[PDB]
Amino acid sequence: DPEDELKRVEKLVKEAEELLRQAKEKGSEEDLEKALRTAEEAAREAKKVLEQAEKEGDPEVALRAVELVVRVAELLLRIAKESGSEEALERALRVAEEAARLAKRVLELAEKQGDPEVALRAVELVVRVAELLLRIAKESGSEEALERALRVAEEAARLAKRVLELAEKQGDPEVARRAVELVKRVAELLERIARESGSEEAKERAERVREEARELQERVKELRER
C-alpha cells in the first residue's frame, strides 16, 4: 500500500529531523551522521514509491513522494550548514538535482493521466527545487550550482507552458491562469537573482521568461474569450 509507504517515508523524515535537533542540542556528531543516513533512506524509499507510482499510474502518490524527496533535500542542506561538511552539502545538491528530474517525471505522468493540478504542483515543486539549488549555491559558492539553479528555474518556467497546454486541452482556465502566475513567479525570481547577484545569465533568462508570460497571458485570454 503506497499510503503506508508514504507515511513511512514521512516518519523517517521526522525522525531524521529530530536526530538533527538532538544533534544540535547535545552536540553529537553521530546523531548528525545517522540523521544524514536516515534522511537518505527516506529519499530512497520515496523514490521507490515514485517508481511504483509510475507503473500504477497514480500522479498524487508520485507528487507526494517527490515533494518528500525535496523535503529530504532541504533537510540535507540544513544538516550540511550545521556540520559544515562539504560532502553532506554535495549530497544535498545531488538529492536536489534528482528531485528536479523526478518532479519532471511526475509532470509527464500527470500529462499521461490527464491531471492538470498535479502537473501544476509538479512545476511549483520544480521551482522549489530551483530555489533550493539557489540556497545550496549560496552556501557552497559553487558557480555550477548557480548555473544548475537558473537552468532548473527557466526549465520550470518552460514546463508551465506544457501545463497550460494540458489545461487548455481539458478546458481548465483556472489552472492555466495559475500557470501564468507561475511563469511570472519564475520571472520575478530571475529578476531578484539578477538584482542581487548581477548575473549575466539571470537577466537574459528573465527576459525570455517575461516574453513567455507575455504570450501565455494572451493565450489564456484567448481561452477565456471563447
> Hey, is 141 helix, strand or coil?
coil
Place of cell 544548475: 148
Domain ranges of the chain: 1-113
Asked if 123 contacts 65 with a C-beta cutoff of 8 angstroms, the reply is no
Which residues make Cβ contacts (< 8 Å) with residue 42, sequence separation at least 6? 9, 12, 13, 16, 68, 72
Question: What is d(CA 73, CA 123) in angstroms, rounded to the nearest whole number?
Answer: 17
- Cα four-point dihedral sign 8, 45, 52, 115: positive
Question: What is d(CA 136, CA 59) in angstroms, rounded to the nearest whole number?
Answer: 28
Closest CA to 36 of 49, 25, 23: 23
Please give the torsion angle defined by the CA atoms of residues 53, 150, 175 and 167, in that order, rounded to the nearest 10 degrees. Answer: -70
> Hey, is 180 helix, strand or coil?
helix
The three three-digit cell numbers of residue 25, written as one number: 542540542
Q: Where are the beta strands (DSSP E) in the chain?
A: none
Closest CA to 113 of 159, 57, 62: 57
Phi, psi of 186 (to 5 degrees): -60, -40
- 200-225 vs 173-197: helix crossing angle, rounded to 10: 160
Asked if 170 contacts 144 with a C-beta cutoff of 8 angstroms, the reply is no
Question: What is d(CA 29, CA 83) in angstroms, rounded to the nearest whole number?
Answer: 8
**What is the identity of the amino acid at 162?**
R
- Largest separation between any pair of C-alpha atoms in the chain: 63
Q: How many residues does the chain have?
A: 226
For residue 94, CA distances in Å to 20, 35, 42, 44, 178 come to 20, 17, 15, 13, 30
Question: How was this structure obtained?
Answer: X-ray
For residue 59, CA distances in Å to 18, 66, 115, 210 come to 30, 10, 8, 29
Output Rg (C-alpha) for the chain, integer angstroms. Answer: 19
Asked if 112 contacts 58 with a C-beta cutoff of 8 angstroms, the reply is no
